[model samples]
Each structure stands twice: as C-alpha cells, then as structure tokens.
Target: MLPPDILQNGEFETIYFQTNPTYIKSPIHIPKSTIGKPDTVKIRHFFALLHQDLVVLGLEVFVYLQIYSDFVEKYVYVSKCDTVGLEKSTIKIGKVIGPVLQYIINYNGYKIKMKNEYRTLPKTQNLRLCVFTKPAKEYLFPNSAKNPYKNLLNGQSLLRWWISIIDSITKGWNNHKLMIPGADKYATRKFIEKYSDWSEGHIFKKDGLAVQAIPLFPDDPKGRFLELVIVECRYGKMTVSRFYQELAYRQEFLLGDCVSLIGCCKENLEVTYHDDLVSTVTISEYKEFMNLLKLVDFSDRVEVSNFVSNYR
Candidate 1:
C-alpha cells in the first residue's frame, strides 16, 4: 500500500499505469519520514519511487539529473516512450507516486514535448534532470581572454547583461534624458514628445539579422505611434528611409557586445512585433551551452558526486 499522505494530497490530472504481468511487481519501500526532509533527500527518494512506479506500470521511461553552473536551481527530466495505458489507473498511480514527486514534475521538471513513434522511441527515452549549482568565485568575473563584453558567456550571463541594458535605456527614456548616438538633440526631443508612452518590448530575428523592437504611444489602443527597431549583424550596412506618413530615426553601431536601434514611425492601425528570440538557439547548441556551464562547477566534484551517488 502507498502512504496515506501521498494519496490524500497528491495532485494527479493525467497519469499512466501498466497491465503486463511481467511488469507488475512490488513497490519500493520508502520511509514516511523521508517526505519531511530537505529537497535533497526528498529528491533522492522520489527517484527510487518513480523507478518502482515505472516498472510496475510497464512504462518505458528514463529519469536522470543534470547540473548547470550558470544557474542556482535544479531541474528534473522525464522521458517516456509509451503513453498507451496513461489513463488506465490515474488515481491509483497518483497514490503510489505521492506529492513530493508530483510537485517536482509539475514545477521543477524540464518540460520537453516529444512525439511517440517507433522510429523516435530511442531519442524520446533520454530524459535528463538539470540541476544548477553556484559558480566559483573566479568564474563570476573571469579575465582570461579579450572578447566582446569582458567575461560574458553566451548563457545566463549574456541574457542578464542584455536585460540590464534594456532596463537602463527604458529608464533614461522615461526621464527624457535619453540621447541616441549620431542624432540631433532638438530632433530627438521633438520625436520623443510625439511618442511619450512606452507600451512593450520585443526581441526577434529578421532576414538573418538579430532585431529588437520597442513600441511606444498606443494612442488608438490597437496600434502604436512609433516602433524602434534595433538590428545587429556581424557585417554589412543598412540604409534608413522615411515615407510620407512615416518618420525615420537612426543610431550608429558601436560594436560593443550590443546591437543598434533604428526608429520608424508610421500612421497605421496594426501592432506587429512579437518576442521570438528563444527559438533562434538550436537544440544542440542549447544542450552544449548547458553542459559547458555544468563543467564550470565541477570544482566541487567531490561533493557533487557524493550527493549524486545517493540518487543513483
């Protein structure tokens, strides 16, 4: 029998179960007191319970842990190869799995969507739980090589830096103290007065160029008075143009680990910019970047290995 606390408190909306005689077996034994401990111990026990549940349900699944140094949080990954019997015994499976694992799955797990197919079974079965750890003091601000933005890696550090830049610029604009490079002060003031309210910000890619857009002054509630576009590229130049009902504003690029902005204002009734930057990074690059961050925290390998062995 499963713990009463788990059965009463565990939240299960969609669950799976097994029916094959060979897969049905006794559940793993975990102390009731284990649920009250720290997350570290709770996670270890949860993995064992999950393994037992998977076998008993005849589900082909894999669960593992992953650590990244750029972040300070942990993640759990679950990859299941079959979902044929998922709705068979939802409540029964929920009772056996318990609340601790349920909480982790809902909140802390890496949510990866995959297709169930015979050809894709092997790829879909590789689930990795990602755990983040604190970075070493030296790595927080390294100075080994000369590059764009000193000590900036293409991970969380890069993202944070970009966000800070946006916040600073937004503040400057709100205060009317913002100055665009290579633009006249009088003209900038006139332009700022026309579009006084900042509505939204977005990041996307256009025609192989990284672009960021900031919309201002939604006077009509369905459109913006101005749209600021920042385009970044390793090479090539772009021309600025103005139409009868449009205004063109340009800023020079400094190539200092940042992109440049070009403003365009049109008298139209459509807001057409959306944030889609996360989709640019391919799966392989994302995985590699995460693994690289994980490697940086291996300085505490002894402790990490000791903690990991318990779950194994």
Candidate 2:
C-alpha cells in the first residue's frame, strides 16, 4: 500500500508513529532538489541516498521507512544502533530535515508479525526516542586541533621575557632569582639596561626600581649570575649588601630560614666591597647582624631603608 498523501506534499515535516493502534507536524526547509517531488518520493529517495552514503562511509546497517495512515505517522528505523553514523549520514544526505526524532527499537520477528496481523504487540522493543535541535554548522563540521602555544615564545620580546621572569618569581624559582642563560646574557643585560632607563616613560617603571643581575660567584670562570630584587636608595642607587642584610634579618626574625634572600651566596662574597667598604655578611654572622639592625631599630641604618624598599 502507498504511504499517506500528506508526506508527499514536497515539504519536510515531522511525522509521529504509534504501536498496535497506539498513536504526530512541523514544516522544515526542503532542499532545491526535493522541492518538486512528492513527499513519498522524497522519503524514499532520502532513505535510498542514506543507504548509499552509509555504505560509502563503511557503515553496515539496514534502514527502512514505514508509514501508517490511521494517524498519518511515519517511522524510520535502522537495523543496527549505529546512532552516530546514521545521524552523520542523514545530515550529509541533506534530505531529512531536523529536529529529527530518533527512536531505537529492538528487533523481534514475533512482535513485527503481531503488529502487522492483529495490530497489537507486547512491549518487546526498547523505546529510546531522541529528539534534538539541529546542531550548529561549526559543530557538525568541527575544525581540526591546533597548537595554541606555537607562537608563545616566538618573538622573544623584552616584555615577554620580563613576564616569564616574573612568573618564575611567583613560583619561587631559584628563590626568586631568575637566571639568564649564558647565551642570552648580553642580550638580557642590554634589555635590562634599556628597561631601567626607558621604564620611567613606560609601563615597567616600577619593576625597574629593583632589577639587578648579581654575580653569585665572582671568581668562577663561567661567570655565574642571577637576577634579584635589589634595594634602591632615595638617590636611585642599588644597595645590594643592605638588601642581603635586611633580607637575612627579616627572614630569620619573621619566617625563619625557610626563605633565603641570598640563595647560594650566603658565604661566598666574604671580602666583597660595596660603598667602598666590606659589605658581604656571611651565614655565620647572620644572627649578630640581625641583632645589630634590630638594636639600631633600622632607624638610621641603610639596612632598614633597604628592607622597607625591597619589601614594598
């Protein structure tokens, strides 16, 4: 027997189906190719193309379209529950208009015969009716994966390097001393010099106030150096010794030795001169130094000024 005439109306519409005298239309856009054809022809041709495309896509399944006239409902079923493949192929075929209701029915030969003969069948099929809106075009055809960080370090700009150094500080890397590679030493030094000079007119003005590359081991042949936040006096002169002394004293009195201001240079620079005086404080003298700074209350001492400046 022929399917209902309403389905042959040359426009895509929603059709509902019921079981055993048990008992649904929204018009959808019709493609140019199917505009003049009868709805039955459209339905048949759509499923034929669907089957063809499924086979072409290597999906193994049987698809059938059954229509009933008692309530003017149409049902489409696939022999296998290859939902993804069927949905993709159906959309690719560009004939079945959505939102489409997908009902996954279990196969039972006896139930089919019973429905055909007596118009009655037991609930032998699992009814999983999935009705969903049409997905966005982007989602239907997703773009491939791409590398987000491919250009993260490409330019190697000064600001980017500074940010990287700041990030390392936040993570407590090397006790907040960002070590520049020996290869980038000259380039980094030039950048730091330029940054310190021009920073007054730029966004990095405050950051320049405490930037310094201290020689961790002055006598080493390789020339090991590290970046640290030095204390700047009112005259814009960096007082490295005072910074170290204050850092040691404050850390010991407050948080203890958990945080070392001078990571590995606590004892190496015993005879170093700063402000034309022996300024290096060894690890052994940390207690006495801290006491001296505390007794003087850091009021007239450069150590206290350095401490306040560095902490700020």
Per-model TM values vs. the true structure? 0.17, 0.14
Candidate 2 clash total?
A: 1
Query: Which one is best on TM-score?
Result: 1
Which pairs in model 2 have colliding backbones? 8-39
lDDT per residue (tens digit) for residues 169-210 in model 2:
223221122222221345434433633222111111133222
Cand. 2 TM to true fold: 0.14
Cα distance off (Å), candidate 1, residue 250: 38
**lDDT agreement with native, every candidate:** 0.25, 0.23
- Root-mean-square deviation (CA) per prediction: 25.1, 38.1
Query: Could you tell me which 10 consecutive residues in candidate 1 have the lowest summed lDDT?
Result: 18-27
Residue lDDT tens for model 1, 1-312: 245544344442123221111111111112344332211111211121222222112111222222112211122322211111212333343334333333333222232233211111111111112111111123211221232222223323432332332333333222212222333556434433534542222121123311111112112110111222222331122222211012212221221222212211111112222222221233354344335433432234343334234323
Number of colliding residue pairs in model 1: 5
